[PDB]
Tab-separated table of C-alpha atoms and ligand atoms in Angstrom:
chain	number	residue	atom	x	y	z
A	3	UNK	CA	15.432	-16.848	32.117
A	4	UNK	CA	17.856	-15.511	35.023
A	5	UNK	CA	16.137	-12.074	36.019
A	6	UNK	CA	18.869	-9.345	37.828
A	7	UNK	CA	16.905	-6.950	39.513
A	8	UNK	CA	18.694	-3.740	39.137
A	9	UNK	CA	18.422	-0.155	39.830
A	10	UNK	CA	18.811	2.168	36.411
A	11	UNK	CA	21.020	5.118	36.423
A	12	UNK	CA	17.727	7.181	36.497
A	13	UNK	CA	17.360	5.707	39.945
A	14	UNK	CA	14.310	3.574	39.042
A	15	UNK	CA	14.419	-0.162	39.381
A	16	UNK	CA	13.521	-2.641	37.048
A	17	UNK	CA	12.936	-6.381	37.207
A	18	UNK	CA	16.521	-7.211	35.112
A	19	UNK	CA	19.200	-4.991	34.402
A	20	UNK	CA	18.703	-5.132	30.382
A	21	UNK	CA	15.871	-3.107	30.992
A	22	UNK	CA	17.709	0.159	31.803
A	23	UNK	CA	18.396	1.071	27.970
A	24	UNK	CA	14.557	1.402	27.325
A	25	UNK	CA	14.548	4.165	29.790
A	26	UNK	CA	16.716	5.901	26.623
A	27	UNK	CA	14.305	4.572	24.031
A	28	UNK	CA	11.126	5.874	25.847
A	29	UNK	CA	12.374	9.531	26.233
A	30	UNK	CA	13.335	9.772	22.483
A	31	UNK	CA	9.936	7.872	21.541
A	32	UNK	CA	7.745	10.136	24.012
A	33	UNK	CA	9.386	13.198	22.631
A	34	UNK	CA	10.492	12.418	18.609
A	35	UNK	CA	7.552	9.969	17.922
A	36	UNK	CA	4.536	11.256	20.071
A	37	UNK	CA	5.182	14.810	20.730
A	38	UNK	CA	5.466	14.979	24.262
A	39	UNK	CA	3.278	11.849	25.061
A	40	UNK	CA	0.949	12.359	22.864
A	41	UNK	CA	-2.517	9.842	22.630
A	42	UNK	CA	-2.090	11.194	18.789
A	43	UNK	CA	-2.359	9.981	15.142
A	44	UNK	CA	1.008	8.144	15.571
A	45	UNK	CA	0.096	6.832	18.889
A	46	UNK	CA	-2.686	4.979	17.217
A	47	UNK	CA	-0.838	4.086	14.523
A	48	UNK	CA	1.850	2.577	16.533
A	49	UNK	CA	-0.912	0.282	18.611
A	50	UNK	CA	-2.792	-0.524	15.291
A	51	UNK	CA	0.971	-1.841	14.302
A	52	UNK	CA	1.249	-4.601	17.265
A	53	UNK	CA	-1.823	-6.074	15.739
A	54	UNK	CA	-0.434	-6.217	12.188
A	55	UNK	CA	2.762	-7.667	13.391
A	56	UNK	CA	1.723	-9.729	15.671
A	57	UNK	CA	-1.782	-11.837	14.397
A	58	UNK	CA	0.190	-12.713	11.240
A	59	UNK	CA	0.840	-16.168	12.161
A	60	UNK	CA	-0.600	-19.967	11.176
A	61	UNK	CA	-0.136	-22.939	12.634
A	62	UNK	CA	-3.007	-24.192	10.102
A	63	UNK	CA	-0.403	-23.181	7.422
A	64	UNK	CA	2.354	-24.469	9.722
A	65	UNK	CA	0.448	-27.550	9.304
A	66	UNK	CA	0.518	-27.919	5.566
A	67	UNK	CA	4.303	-27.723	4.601
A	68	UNK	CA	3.972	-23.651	4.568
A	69	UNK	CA	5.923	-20.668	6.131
A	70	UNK	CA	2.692	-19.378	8.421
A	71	UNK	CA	4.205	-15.949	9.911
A	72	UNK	CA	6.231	-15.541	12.994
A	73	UNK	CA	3.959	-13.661	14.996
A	74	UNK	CA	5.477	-10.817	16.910
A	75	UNK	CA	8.669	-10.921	15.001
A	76	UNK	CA	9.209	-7.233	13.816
A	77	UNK	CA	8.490	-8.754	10.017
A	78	UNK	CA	6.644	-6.073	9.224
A	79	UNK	CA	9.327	-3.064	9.623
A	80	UNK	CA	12.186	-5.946	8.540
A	81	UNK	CA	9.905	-6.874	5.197
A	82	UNK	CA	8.026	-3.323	5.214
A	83	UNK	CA	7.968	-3.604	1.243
A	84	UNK	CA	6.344	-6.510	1.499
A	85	UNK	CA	4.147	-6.651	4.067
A	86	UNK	CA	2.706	-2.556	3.944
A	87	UNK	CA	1.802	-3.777	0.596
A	88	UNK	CA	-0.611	-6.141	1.470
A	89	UNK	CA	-4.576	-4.675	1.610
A	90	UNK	CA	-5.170	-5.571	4.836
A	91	UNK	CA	-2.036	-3.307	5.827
A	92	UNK	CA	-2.828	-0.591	3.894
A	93	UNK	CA	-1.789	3.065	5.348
A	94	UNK	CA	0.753	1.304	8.277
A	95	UNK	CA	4.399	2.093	5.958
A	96	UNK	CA	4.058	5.350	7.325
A	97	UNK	CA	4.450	4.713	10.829
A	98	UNK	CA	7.013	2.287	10.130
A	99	UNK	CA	9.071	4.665	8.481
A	100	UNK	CA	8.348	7.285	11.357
A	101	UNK	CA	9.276	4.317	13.582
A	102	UNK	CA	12.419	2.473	12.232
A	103	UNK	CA	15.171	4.984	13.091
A	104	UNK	CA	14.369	4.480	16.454
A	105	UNK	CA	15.437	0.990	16.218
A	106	UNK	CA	18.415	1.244	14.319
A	107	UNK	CA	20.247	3.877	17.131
A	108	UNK	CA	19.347	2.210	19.290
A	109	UNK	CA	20.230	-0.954	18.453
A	110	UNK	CA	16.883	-2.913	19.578
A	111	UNK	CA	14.644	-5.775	18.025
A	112	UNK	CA	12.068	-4.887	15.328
A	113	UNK	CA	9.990	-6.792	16.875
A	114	UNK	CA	10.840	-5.597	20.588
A	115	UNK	CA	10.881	-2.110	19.421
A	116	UNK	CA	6.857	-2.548	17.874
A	117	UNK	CA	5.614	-4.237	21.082
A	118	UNK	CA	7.238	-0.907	23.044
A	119	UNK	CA	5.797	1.994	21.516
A	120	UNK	CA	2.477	-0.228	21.295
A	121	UNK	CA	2.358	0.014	25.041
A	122	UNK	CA	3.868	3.577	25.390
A	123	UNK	CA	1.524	4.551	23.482
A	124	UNK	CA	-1.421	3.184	25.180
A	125	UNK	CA	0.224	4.292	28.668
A	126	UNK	CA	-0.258	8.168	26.982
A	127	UNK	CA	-3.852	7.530	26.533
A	128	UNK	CA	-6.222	8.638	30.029
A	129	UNK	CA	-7.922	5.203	31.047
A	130	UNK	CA	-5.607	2.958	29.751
A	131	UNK	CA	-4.780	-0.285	31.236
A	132	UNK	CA	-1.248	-0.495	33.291
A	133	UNK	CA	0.467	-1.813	30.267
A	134	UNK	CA	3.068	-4.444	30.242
A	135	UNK	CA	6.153	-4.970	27.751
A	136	UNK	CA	8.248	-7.405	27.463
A	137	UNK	CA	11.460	-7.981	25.541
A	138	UNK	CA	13.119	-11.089	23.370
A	139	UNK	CA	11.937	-10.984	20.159
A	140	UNK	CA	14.283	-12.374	17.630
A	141	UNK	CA	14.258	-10.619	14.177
A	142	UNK	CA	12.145	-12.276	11.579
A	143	UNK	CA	13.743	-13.886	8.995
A	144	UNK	CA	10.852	-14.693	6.135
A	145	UNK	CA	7.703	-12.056	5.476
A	146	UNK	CA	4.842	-12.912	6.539
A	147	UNK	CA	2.259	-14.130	4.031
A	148	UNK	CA	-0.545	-12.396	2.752
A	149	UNK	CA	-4.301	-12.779	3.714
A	150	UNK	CA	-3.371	-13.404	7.844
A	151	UNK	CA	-4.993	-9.432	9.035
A	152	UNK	CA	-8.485	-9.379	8.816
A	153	UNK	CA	-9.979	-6.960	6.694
A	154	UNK	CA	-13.293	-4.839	7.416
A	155	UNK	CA	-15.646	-6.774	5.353
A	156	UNK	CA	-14.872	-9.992	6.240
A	157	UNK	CA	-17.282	-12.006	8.285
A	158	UNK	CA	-17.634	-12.614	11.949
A	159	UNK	CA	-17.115	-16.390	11.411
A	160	UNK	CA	-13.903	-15.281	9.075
A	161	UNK	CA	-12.440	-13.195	12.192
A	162	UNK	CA	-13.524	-15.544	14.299
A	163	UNK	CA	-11.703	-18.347	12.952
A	164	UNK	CA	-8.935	-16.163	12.314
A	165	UNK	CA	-7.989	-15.249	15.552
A	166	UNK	CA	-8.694	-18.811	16.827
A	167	UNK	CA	-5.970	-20.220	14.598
A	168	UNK	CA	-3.681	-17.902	15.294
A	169	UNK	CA	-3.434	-17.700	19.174
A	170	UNK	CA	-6.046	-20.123	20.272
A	171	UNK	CA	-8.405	-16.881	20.851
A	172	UNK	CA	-12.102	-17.510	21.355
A	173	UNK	CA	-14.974	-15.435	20.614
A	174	UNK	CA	-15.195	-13.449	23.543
A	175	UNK	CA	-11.056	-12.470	23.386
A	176	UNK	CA	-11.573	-11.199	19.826
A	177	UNK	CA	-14.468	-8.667	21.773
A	178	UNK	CA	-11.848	-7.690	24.362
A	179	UNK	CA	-9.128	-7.173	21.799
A	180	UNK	CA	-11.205	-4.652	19.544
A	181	UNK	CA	-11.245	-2.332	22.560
A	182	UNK	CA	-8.281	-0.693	20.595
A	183	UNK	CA	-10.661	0.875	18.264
A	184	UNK	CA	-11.389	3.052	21.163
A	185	UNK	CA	-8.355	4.902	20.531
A	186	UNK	CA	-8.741	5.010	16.631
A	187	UNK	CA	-9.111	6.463	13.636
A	188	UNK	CA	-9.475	5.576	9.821
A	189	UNK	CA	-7.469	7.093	7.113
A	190	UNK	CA	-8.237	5.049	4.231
A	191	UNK	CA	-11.130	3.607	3.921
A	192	UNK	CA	-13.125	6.968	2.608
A	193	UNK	CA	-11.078	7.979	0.042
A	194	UNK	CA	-12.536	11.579	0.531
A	195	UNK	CA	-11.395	12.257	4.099
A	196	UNK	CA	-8.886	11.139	6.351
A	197	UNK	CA	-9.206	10.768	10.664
A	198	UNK	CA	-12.214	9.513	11.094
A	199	UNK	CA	-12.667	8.184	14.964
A	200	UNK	CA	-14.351	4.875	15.536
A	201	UNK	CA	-15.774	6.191	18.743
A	202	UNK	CA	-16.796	9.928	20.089
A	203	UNK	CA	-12.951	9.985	22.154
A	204	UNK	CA	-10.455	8.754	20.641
A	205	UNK	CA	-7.726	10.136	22.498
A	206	UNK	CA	-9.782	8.341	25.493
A	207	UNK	CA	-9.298	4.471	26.674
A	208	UNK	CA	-12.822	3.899	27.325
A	209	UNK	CA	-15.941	2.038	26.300
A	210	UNK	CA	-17.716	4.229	23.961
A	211	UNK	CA	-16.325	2.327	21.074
A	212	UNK	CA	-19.016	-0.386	22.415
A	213	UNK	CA	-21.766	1.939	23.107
A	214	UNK	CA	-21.869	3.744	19.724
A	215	UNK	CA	-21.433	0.714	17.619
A	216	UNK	CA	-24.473	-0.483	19.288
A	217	UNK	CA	-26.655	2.947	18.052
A	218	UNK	CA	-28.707	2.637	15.089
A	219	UNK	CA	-26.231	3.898	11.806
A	220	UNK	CA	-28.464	7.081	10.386
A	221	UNK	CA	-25.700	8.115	8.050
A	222	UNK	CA	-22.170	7.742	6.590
A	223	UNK	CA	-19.945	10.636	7.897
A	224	UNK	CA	-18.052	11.434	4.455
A	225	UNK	CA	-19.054	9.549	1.126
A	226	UNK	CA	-21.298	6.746	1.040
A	227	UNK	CA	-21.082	2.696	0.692
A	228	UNK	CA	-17.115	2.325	0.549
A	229	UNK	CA	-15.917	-1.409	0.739
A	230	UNK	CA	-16.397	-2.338	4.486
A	231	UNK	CA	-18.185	0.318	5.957
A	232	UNK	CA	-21.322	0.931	7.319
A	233	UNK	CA	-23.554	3.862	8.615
A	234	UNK	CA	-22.801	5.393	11.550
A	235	UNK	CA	-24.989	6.922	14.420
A	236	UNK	CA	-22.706	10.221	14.729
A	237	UNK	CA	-21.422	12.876	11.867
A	238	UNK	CA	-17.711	12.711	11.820
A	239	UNK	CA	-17.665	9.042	13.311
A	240	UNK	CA	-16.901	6.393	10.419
A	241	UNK	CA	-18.371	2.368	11.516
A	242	UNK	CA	-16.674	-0.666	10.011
A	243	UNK	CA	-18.721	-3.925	9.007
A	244	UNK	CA	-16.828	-6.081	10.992
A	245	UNK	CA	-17.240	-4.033	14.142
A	246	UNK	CA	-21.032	-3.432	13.282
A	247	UNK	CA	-21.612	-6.935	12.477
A	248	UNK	CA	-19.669	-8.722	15.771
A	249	UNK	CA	-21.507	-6.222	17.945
A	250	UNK	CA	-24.955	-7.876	16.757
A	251	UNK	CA	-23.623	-11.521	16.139
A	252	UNK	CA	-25.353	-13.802	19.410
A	253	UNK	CA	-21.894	-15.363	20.173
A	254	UNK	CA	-19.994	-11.766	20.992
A	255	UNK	CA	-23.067	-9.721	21.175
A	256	UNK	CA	-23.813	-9.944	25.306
A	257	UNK	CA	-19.501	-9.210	25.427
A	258	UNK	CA	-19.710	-6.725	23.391
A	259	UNK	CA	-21.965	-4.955	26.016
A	260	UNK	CA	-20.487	-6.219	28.565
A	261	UNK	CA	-17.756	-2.969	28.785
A	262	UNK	CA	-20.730	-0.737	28.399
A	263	UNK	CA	-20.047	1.239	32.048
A	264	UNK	CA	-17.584	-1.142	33.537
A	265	UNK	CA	-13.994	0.159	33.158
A	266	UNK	CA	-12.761	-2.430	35.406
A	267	UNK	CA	-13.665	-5.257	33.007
A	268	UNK	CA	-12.498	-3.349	29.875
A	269	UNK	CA	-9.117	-2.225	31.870
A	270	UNK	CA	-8.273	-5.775	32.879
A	271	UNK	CA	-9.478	-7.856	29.602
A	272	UNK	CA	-7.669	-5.625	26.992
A	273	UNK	CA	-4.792	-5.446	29.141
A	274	UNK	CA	-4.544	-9.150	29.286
A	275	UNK	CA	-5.233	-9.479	25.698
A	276	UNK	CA	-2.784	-6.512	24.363
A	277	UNK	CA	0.258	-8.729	26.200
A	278	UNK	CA	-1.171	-12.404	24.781
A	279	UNK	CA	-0.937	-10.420	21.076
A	280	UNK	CA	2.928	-8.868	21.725
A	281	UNK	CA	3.718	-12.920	22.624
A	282	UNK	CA	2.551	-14.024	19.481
A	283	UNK	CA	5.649	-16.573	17.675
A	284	UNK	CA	7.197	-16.486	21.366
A	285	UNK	CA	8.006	-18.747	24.173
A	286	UNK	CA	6.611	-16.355	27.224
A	287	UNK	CA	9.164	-18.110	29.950
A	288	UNK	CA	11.996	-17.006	27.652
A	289	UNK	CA	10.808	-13.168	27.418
A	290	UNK	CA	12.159	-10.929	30.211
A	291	UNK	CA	9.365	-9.137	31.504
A	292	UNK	CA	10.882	-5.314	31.364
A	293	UNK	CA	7.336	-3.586	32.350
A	294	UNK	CA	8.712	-1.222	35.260
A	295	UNK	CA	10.040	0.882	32.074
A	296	UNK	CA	6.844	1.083	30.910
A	297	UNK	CA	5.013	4.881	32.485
A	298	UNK	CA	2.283	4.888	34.506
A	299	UNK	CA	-1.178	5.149	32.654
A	300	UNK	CA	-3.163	8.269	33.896
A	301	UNK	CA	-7.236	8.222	35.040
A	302	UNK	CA	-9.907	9.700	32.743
A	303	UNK	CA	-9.962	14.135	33.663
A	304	UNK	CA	-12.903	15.715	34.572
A	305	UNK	CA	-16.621	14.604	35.899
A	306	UNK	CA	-18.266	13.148	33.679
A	307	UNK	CA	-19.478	9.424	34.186
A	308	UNK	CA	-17.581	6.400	32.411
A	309	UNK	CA	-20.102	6.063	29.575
A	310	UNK	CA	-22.689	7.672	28.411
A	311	UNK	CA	-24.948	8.397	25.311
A	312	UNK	CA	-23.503	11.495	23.036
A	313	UNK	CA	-25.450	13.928	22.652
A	314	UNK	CA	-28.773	13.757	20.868
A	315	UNK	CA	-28.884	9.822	21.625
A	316	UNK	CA	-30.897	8.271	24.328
A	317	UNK	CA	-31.594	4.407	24.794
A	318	UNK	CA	-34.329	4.335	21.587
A	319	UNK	CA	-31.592	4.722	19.787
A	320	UNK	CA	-29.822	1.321	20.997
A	321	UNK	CA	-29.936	-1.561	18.662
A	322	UNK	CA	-30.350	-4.251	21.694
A	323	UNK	CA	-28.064	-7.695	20.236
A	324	UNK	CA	-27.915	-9.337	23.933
A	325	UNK	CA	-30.255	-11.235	24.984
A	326	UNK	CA	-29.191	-12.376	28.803
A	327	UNK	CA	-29.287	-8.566	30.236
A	328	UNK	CA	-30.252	-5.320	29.291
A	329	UNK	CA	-28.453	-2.680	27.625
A	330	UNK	CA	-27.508	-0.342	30.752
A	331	UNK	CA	-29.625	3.327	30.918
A	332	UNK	CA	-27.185	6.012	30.060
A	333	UNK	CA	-26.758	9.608	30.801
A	334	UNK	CA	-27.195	11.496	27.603
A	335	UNK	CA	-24.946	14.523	27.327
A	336	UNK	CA	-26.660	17.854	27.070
A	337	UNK	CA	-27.010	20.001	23.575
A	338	UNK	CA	-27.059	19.520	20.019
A	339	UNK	CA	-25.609	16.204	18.472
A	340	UNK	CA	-22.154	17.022	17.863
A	341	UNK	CA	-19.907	15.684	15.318
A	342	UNK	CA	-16.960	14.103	16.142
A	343	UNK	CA	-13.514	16.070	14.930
A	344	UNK	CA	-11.602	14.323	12.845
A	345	UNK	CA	-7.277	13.423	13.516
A	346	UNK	CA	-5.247	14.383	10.660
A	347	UNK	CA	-2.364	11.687	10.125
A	348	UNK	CA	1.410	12.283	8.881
A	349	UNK	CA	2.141	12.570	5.215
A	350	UNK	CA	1.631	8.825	3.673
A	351	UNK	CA	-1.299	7.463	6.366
B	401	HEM	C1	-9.950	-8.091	14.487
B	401	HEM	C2	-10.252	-7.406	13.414
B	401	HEM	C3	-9.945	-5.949	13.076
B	401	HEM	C4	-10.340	-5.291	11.974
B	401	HEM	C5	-11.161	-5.854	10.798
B	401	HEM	C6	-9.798	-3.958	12.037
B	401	HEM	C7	-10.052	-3.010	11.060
B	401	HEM	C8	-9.507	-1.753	11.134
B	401	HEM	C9	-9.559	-0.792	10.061
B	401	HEM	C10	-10.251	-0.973	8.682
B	401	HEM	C11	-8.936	0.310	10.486
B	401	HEM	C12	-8.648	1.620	9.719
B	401	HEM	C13	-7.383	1.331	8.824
B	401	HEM	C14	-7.026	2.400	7.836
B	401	HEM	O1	-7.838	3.291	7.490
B	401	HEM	O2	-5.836	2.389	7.381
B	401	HEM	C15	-8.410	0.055	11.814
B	401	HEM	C16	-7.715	0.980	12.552
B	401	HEM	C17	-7.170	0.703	13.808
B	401	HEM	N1	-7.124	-0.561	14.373
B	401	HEM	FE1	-8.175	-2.163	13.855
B	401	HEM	N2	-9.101	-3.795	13.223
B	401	HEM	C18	-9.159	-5.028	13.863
B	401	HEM	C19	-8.580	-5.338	15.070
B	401	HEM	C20	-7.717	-4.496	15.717
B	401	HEM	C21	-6.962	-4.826	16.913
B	401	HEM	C22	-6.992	-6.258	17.545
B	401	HEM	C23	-6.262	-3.783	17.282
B	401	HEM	C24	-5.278	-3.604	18.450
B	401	HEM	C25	-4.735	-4.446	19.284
B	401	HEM	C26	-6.592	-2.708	16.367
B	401	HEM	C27	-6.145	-1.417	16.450
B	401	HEM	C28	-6.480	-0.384	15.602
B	401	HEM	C29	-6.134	0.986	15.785
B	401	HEM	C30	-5.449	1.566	17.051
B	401	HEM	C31	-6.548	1.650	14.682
B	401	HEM	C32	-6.467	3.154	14.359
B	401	HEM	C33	-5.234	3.521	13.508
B	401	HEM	C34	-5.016	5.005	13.365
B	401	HEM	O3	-5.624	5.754	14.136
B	401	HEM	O4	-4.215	5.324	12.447
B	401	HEM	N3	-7.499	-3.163	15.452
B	401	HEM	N4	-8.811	-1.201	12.194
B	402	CA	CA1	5.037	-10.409	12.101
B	403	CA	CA1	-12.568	6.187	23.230
């Protein structure tokens, strides 16, 4: 692919001139979609989306006469009667309803557009990776087929083999690429409430997600034993079985910890690992790498170290899985345990 470095009419330069027009699409995005740049319900929805896109693909199927998925082909928003209908993809029709007039004025990809707002949205998150985005994804043409997302209550050795057929992931990429549930919250598996964070910040890029899966689960936050979840350790904070379960497996378990209080390692691997998933179908040496459009992620506010234990949680508390090194000794934050507030989605989530 012939780059030409160019300089926008913003005054910004980017690494090839077709890159200028997203400077359009990110101002309408940051101010129509997030509300001012927002780390928000449709911020999460919109990273949740890349996934849901782009692991839909199978070269096993490939490999037995069938249509497997194209990856990161925009199917989803192309086929959204199809594909939002699928269990696995439950809630996502309304952010690609919230998201699709976007692409139509302004004339981009489907499957460009997804990979975009995936990364702009991470970029409005504090602690977020530098993201990257790159552009030259063709519009699907066939749906992809059902059972390709995994689904809470599958097993470890389902998502495991999973991911590993459709990118060639391993065990310890399917760790680094759960780091999303950081910024995350679930609208329909409790059927009684809606916005319930995975982890104590979710407006926050950090590793909490990995140090509260690893507490004990005392309770469920709304009603009890709904298909694939599991007690948590905080009110207002929902656990899923498959995030319970590949936190304790021995394969992921010593990965799993390994973000506990190292922000460089969970900064670098899930920014790695977000790009591998938007190149999913693709041929990376034909993509044009448009990242300079992309904002600047911002550092975490305030004082307070890079993990720690919520309140009313100490290192008792820990359910050790690793067996090469310690869980690390964490600050507890002062007071009462506090429950975790809840993120009311759109109509439709
Ligand atoms: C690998 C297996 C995974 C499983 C089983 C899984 C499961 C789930 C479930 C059950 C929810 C709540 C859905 C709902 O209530 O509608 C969810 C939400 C979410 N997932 Fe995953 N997930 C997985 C991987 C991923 C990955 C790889 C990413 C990102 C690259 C991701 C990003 C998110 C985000 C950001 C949300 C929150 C959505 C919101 O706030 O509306 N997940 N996940
Ligand atoms: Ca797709
Ligand atoms: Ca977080």
């Amino acid at each position: 692919v012939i780059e030409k470095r160019a300089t926008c009419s913003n005054g910004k330069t980017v690494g090839d001139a077709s890159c200028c027009a997203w400077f359009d699409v990110l101002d309408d995005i940051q101010q129509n979609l997030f509300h001012g740049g927002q780390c928000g319900a449709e911020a999460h929805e919109s990273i949740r989306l890349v996934f849901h896109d782009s692991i839909a693909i199978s070269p096993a199927m490939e490999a037995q006469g069938k249509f497997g998925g194209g990856g990161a082909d925009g199917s989803i928003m192309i086929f959204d009667d199809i594909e939002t209908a699928f269990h696995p993809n439950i809630g996502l029709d309304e952010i690609v309803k919230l998201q699709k007039p976007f692409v139509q004025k302004h004339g981009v990809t489907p499957g460009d557009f997804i990979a975009f707002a995936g990364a702009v949205a991470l970029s409005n998150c504090p602690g977020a990776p530098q993201m990257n985005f790159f552009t030259g994804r063709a519009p699907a043409t066939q749906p992809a087929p059902d059972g390709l997302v995994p689904e809470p209550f599958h097993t470890v050795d389902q998502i495991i083999n999973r991911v590993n057929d459709a990118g060639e992931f391993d065990e310890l990429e399917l760790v680094w690429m759960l780091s999303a549930h950081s910024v995350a919250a679930v609208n329909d598996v409790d059927p009684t409430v809606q916005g319930l964070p995975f982890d104590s910040t979710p407006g926050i890029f950090d590793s909490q997600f990995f140090v509260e899966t690893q507490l004990r689960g005392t309770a469920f936050p709304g009603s009890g034993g709904n298909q694939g979840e599991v007690e948590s350790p905080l009110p207002g904070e929902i656990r899923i079985q498959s995030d319970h379960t590949i936190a304790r497996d021995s394969r992921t378990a010593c990965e799993w910890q390994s973000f506990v209080n190292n922000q460089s390692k969970l900064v670098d691997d899930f920014q790695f690992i977000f790009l591998a998933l938007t190149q999913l179908g693709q041929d990376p040496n034909a993509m044009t790498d448009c990242s300079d459009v992309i904002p600047q992620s911002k550092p975490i506010p305030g004082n307070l170290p890079f993990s720690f234990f919520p309140a009313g949680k100490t290192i008792k508390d820990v359910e050790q899985a690793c067996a090469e090194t310690p869980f690390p000794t964490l600050t507890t934050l002062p007071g009462p345990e506090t429950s975790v507030q809840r993120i009311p989605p759109p109509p439709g989530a």
